[PDB]
Structures are given as structure tokens and as C-alpha cells.
Amino acid sequence: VKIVTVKTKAYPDQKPGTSGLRKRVKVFQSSTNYAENFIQSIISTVEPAQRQEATLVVGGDGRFYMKEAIQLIVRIAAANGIGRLVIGQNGILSTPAVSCIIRKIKAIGGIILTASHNPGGPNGDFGIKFNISNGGPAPEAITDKIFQISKTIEEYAICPDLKVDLGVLGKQQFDLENKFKPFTVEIVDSVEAYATMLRNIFDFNALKELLSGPNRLKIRIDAMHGVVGPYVKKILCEELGAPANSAVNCVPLEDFGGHHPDPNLTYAADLVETMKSGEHDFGAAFDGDGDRNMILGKHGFFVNPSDSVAVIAANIFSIPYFQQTGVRGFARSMPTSGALDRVANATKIALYETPTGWKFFGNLMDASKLSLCGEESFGTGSDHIREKDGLWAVLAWLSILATRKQSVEDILKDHWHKFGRNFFTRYDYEEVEAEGATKMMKDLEALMFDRSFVGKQFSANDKVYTVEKADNFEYHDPVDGSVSKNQGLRLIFADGSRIIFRLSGTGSAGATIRLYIDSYEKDNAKINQDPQVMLAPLISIALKVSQLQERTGRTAPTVIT
């Protein structure tokens, strides 16, 4: 194989965010050398003397164009001095799977081809996420260095003629012009190391009795035609024994079967109606790269992502890994409910309120300060890998059903009687006109920081809402030193209820308003009722204090969660 150098011309817009460079498929296949430039810039943050001994892991959610880009990663990595590439079979590797192999085989990092829940196909989205040696996403110092290089890149090295086969397991070696050591491409099965990790974390024997034995928990798992389908089939059906019919949408399709792979009540509607009839006792959906999850009980009973991290924490010792490893810290992002705090306070185990996104979670985990973490945006994880893990949340849930022998609904009623209930909902007011929004935020801030704001009685219906605290949330990371300022506007009442305002403003399209309401109820009688009824007093207080119908003219939200 020949090593060629191609004189290219740099691109202005290749700024990789916390979730890698995400750009619609069209840009990648029509903008000459866009992919090449970004791949050669990623390879370039890796120091020459460290390249020959370096192994990079490669793989992605399976969406359209993933195979072309992998053949690009191989050719450039080869011509560039990279010794070895471990590619998942067929290029398929899930995001929690790639984190798992990087850590296992001590790889330099990995390149993951995924655009998460964002759709795929020719008129779909395409991303290139870079993960580093600890197995987690690259941190800002590395993402910006990729950025500066992609902006000033003049030329990139490639082996044009080289073409590995992705369906063949095993090792492939190639010889590169005059280079003394050969290039190794190793095709690994996609599920093996990941299931070997899960085997030592969970008690597969109890789960096999649950799913196969006379009692048989009749489950329903929808993998929405993304990367986790292979993993459901191999681990839950073949190894654990669940019927073949338990695994819905489990064949990775390039266009995700023309649908958004987003684990929520709106997009996993087919699973939600299927759960309503009553025949299944458990259901779950996952996103395109397998790191987010939706738990469903009997008849469609929605288990809220904030309640779920708290249920798993309240039973965490039912899982072999926690029994042997110990629980060294709990964590949630700030917009997520206070349910996890009610569980954490019942113990001498530390809780951390952090901004949105994994980096906050990751650093605590590397500092040996975090074992279980969750986000209200269908995200759950632990320190086994350095990314979130959808199927791990499902096996943790089946591990709690196995031990408990109660239905999902019963586990939650018990939970709310022990810990009280944190009613939670989330209103997504997608894209508004920036001036009104900034006004609403500055107004609110002013009003919130007053000498008479605090302690004051705000009210409606059965209870009284006394403002115990009110700020614009900022975080000082204990590990990398960064300070994330003005993360969200929040009103905190004395009973425990909260209202968080978060403005996702885009200097390209507009400004999205995310309204989060967390309302703590401790009464034995009010705990089991409907969330929108119990949350309406605090939602109208949020519209009456923010003056949303006023400054941005919006009446109802785009989405409710």
C-alpha cells in the first residue's frame, strides 16, 4: 500500500462541540475533503512518537455514510503512522461499547461515527465524535486544538489503494511504502467485550431465571433500528433467554427506518401503545447510539428519567458490581428532579448538582467521587465506562425486578411512600426571538436577587410557596478547574419545589426556552395523582413570574416530557 500526500484547502466551520462535529450528511459527501480534513486533524492531535504503538477504536450507530467514512479513517490513520485500528464488526460498535473497549485494551482513544438521536439517511445527519484514552469524550482543550488545526490545515496524508473488509472477524495486516512495521486492522465482534463487561457487573443467572423461568417477566425492548439492536438480540435473547419476539426494531438500518431514534413518549409511540394493552410487564426504548433510555412499566406506566436514577439508587446493592465496589457518590444535572437527593440524603453518601452534559459526570467519576448518575433527558450511567449506557439501565432495572419480585408500578409507589414524590415535567418552548427572551431572563434575575424576593410568599390552591433561594446557577468543577457560569435561572421554594428556566439560544436560528418544574409532595394521599394537575399551580406561577405569554407571546409548549 502506497502513502500519498493530498494538498487540501481548509474549512471555516469545523468546530467540534462536546458531542463531536455534527453536520448533515450533505455537507460530508458534497464539500470536497470535509471528512478527510476533520479525520486528518483528529489523527494529528496524536503525537508522532506515540503513533506506531497507538491503537484507535472505530465504530458507530450504523446510519447512512458510516461505512464510507470508516474506510476514510482507516486510509488516513494508516498513512499517518497509526499502528493499529480495532473496528467493530461491520463498523458497528455502540457508544457505551466503544468506551468499554478503549478502557479494556488501553487504546489511545476512539473515533465514534454517530449523530445521536438526530436522524440519518441521505437527508439526515452525520457526526464524528472523538473519545480519548479514559474512554470518555475529548475535553475542550482537545476539541479546540482539533478546531485550530482543521482551520489552518494545508495538506493531509492518505493510503488511497487500501480497503479493509468489515464483515470478516480477525486480524488484517498491510504493508505501507518503506515503513518497517505493518499496519494492523482488527475486526472484533460488536457485542463480545461489552457483554463480557456486563457479565461481571450483573448477576446473569438471576436475570436468566427472571426472563426464562416459570414466573417469566414478559418484556418488550425497542432498539429503534439503531446500534443497540445486535446487543439486545445477543445479550437479552440468546444469552438471557428472553423470547425472540421480545426484541423489537433490532436490525441496524441506515435511515433508522425513516424515523428519529429518540427515546421519548412522542417518538417511541409504537412501544407506548403496545405497552398499554397489559400483556407485557416491562418495556424500554433506546436511542441511535445506545446511551439514553426510556423505562416503561405495565399498561404504559411511564417511569420518568428523574425517578428512575433515584429508584436504581434506592436499591443499588441488588447489583453485584455495587456490592463489591461500594457507592462512592451520586449525581444529577441541575434541571433533573430532587428525587435522587431524597435518596442520597437518607445516607452518608455525597450528592453533586452539576450543569448539563457528561463532562461534569466524567470528571467526578475519574476522581473516584461518583458511582451512579442521571439526567432528566433520558440518561443514566455509572462508573463502569465513561459515557452513558442505555442497556446498562435496563439490566439494572431487571436486576431490581428480580430481587424485589414486585411490578414496576409497585416499586415506584413504595419509593414515593418512603421518599415522598417529586412531581416533574418539562416544557420545551422551541426557538423564540432573542430580545424578549433575554429581557425575561434579566428581569427575572433582577427580581430574583431582591432583599424582599427571598422569604416571600408566592401562592395558589392547597399550599404556600415561600421563595427560599433564587439564582442563576453556576458551577465550579472540582477536577479540571473550569467555572460554568449562568447555566440556568432557578426559583427554589421552602417545601422543596423548584422552577428552572433554561435558554438554549442559537446565533444561527434563534433561542429555545426550556421550562422545568420539580414539585415536592410528601403527603400520603396526594402522592399517587396526576402530574399535570399537581404541577399546574407551579406552572402558572412560572408563567405569571416570567411573563412568557407577554415578552415572547407563546401560549403552549412545543413538547412536554
Write the topology of this structure.
Elements: E1 4-7, E2 21-24, H1 25-30, H2 34-44, H3 48-51, E3 55-60, H4 66-79, E4 84-92, H5 95-104, E5 109-113, E6 125-132, H6 140-152, E7 155-158, E8 170-174, E9 183-188, H7 192-201, H8 204-212, E10 219-222, H9 229-239, E11 247-248, H10 269-276, E12 282-286, E13 293-296, E14 302-303, H11 305-315, H12 320-325, E15 330-333, H13 339-345, E16 351-354, H14 359-366, E17 372-375, E18 379-382, H15 390-404, H16 408-419, E19 421-429, H17 434-448, E20 457-460, E21 463-472, E22 475-476, E23 483-484, E24 489-493, E25 498-506, E26 510-521, H18 531-546, H19 548-551, E27 559-560
Parallel strand pairs: 3-4, 3-5, 4-9, 10-11, 10-12, 15-16, 15-17
Antiparallel strand pairs: 1-7, 2-6, 5-6, 8-9, 12-13, 13-14, 17-18, 19-26, 19-27, 20-21, 21-24, 22-23, 24-25, 25-26
Helix pairs in contact: 2-4, 2-6, 8-15, 11-13
Descriptive report:
This protein is an alpha/beta fold and 561 residues long. Helices cover 34% and strands 25% of the residues. The strands form 6 sheets. Strands 2-6-5-3-4-9-8 form a 7-stranded mixed sheet, with helices on both faces. Strands 20-21-24-25-26-19-27 form a 7-stranded antiparallel sheet. Strands 11-10-12-13-14 form a 5-stranded mixed sheet, with helices on both faces. Helix 2 packs across helix 4, helix 8 crosses helix 15 and helix 11 runs parallel beside helix 13. The N and C termini lie far apart (53 Å). Its cofactor is Mg(2+). Pfam families: PGM1_C_vert_fung (PF24947), PGM_PMM_I (PF02878), PGM_PMM_II (PF02879), PGM_PMM_III (PF02880). GO terms for molecular function: magnesium ion binding; phosphoglucomutase activity. This is Phosphoglucomutase-1.
